[PDB]
Design a protein around this ligand. Structure first.
Ligand SMILES: Nc1nc2c(ncn2[C@@H]2O[C@@H]3COP(=O)(O)O[C@H]4[C@@H](O)[C@H](n5cnc6c(=O)[nH]c(N)nc65)O[C@@H]4COP(=O)(O)O[C@H]3[C@H]2O)c(=O)[nH]1
Ligand SMILES: Nc1nc2c(ncn2[C@@H]2O[C@@H]3COP(=O)(O)O[C@H]4[C@@H](O)[C@H](n5cnc6c(=O)[nH]c(N)nc65)O[C@@H]4COP(=O)(O)O[C@H]3[C@H]2O)c(=O)[nH]1
Lengths: 104, 104, 104, 104
């Protein structure tokens, strides 16, 4: 069994982790990596951003081929139902628990 | 000024919102949309997923051209420093505040 | 059939609320009220604070100044197991869902 | 120069911790301890609970049964403005950062 801090260090190394308290169900959390993207690609290609954000980027960067915007790493959950919940957050219980385990 | 609930309804409609308490700084939050992705593309194309997740998908879906996995909508923050924080979360203060405003 | 924003407005008015899927486990959330306490009370009376915090207050707030410290309102959950989780937080799913209901 | 996991272990041992960038504003987080309270006390004594919750306990827990209710440990923040934010939550950035420090 691990603390949440050990779970986090495992997540940073690319592993899948879970809490025993979740009682299996095929649930686990994982980390999606950071990347820095060109603003022109943000404006002209990226599907998964709302138009208001893309318009803001376009207004402040124009046609720049060199400007970039950093998208941070973040945690996600593969839920029991199979869906990926982007932006998983840790409850007080999760943060203080010592029942974390490695899934992969 | 708006409650967090009004801010959320604005976010669902694609707007950028902020709290006055943040004191400007060009900060705002926004919603990234939901999508359902083919598992073959998850395995063979998606860059922004860790290899452990991609290997799990490959082992359970193989070469399927029809299986899909849903990635939920989520909130993000465009921070003062210009970075996009994926998976923004609301503090108790944020949830209970009535100083939310529309940015765009 | 209530958004999270409407659930929050109901919580601010003292109700117990839940998402429909929680019914089987009987979970709900509620809001604990704000209060402002005098520094002497914090240092010498309040049991539910760690010694380091009481000590910080004593040394960074003379109780000779007449100062009070505000303890903010916050959300809590009555869990399936019957425990009270202080400091409940909303997942992306919870924030964007429209299946909230009033329990009382 | 501490991960969030090491910060959590220090919090569990009663310390006040912060991220380095918080120094200018003097913010820190701390853990409030768990306790178990008898139901009669919850219904008839505890001020810092809403009436609906006290009423729920009274009607879903006879105080004739000898039952106690556990109130979990949780994190809090001493904010820049000096207020105590009950139920502090960790952002993705906070969870993945390695700039945590012990304040006391
Ligand atoms: N709604 C939704 N769609 C998803 C999600 N994950 C993947 N997709 C879809 O899969 C496409 C390819 O993802 P990719 O290979 O990571 O290719 C991505 C990736 O390389 C990069 N990118 C965009 N946003 C981020 C981000 O927040 N973090 C990282 N690390 N890369 C990102 O930009 C490329 C193009 O992005 P898109 O045009 O959006 O193209 C995305 C998008 O249509 C998700 O969680 N939600
Ligand atoms: N560990 C733990 N114990 C709990 C909890 N809820 C109640 N108690 C216990 O019940 C006692 C009485 O609570 P109270 O009548 O609300 O009486 C409280 C309340 O009036 C006030 N107070 C302290 N902290 C807060 C806070 O964060 N918010 C509010 N609104 N009042 C607070 O100070 C009084 C004395 O506090 P204590 O000496 O701590 O005394 C508390 C504490 O021993 C909980 O969630 N966790």
């Amino acid at each position: 069994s691990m603390t949440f801090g050990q779970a986090l260090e495992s997540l940073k190394r690319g592993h899948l982790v879970a809490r025993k308290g979740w009682n299996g169900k095929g649930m686990f959390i994982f980390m999606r990596p950071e990347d820095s993207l060109p603003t022109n690609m943000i404006v002209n290609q990226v599907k998964s951003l709302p138009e208001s954000f893309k318009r803001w980027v376009a207004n402040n960067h124009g046609d720049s081929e060199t400007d970039r915007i950093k998208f941070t790493a973040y945690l996600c959950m593969k839920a029991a139902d199979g869906t990926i919940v982007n932006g998983w957050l840790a409850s007080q219980t999760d943060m203080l628990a010592n029942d974390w385990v490695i899934v992969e």
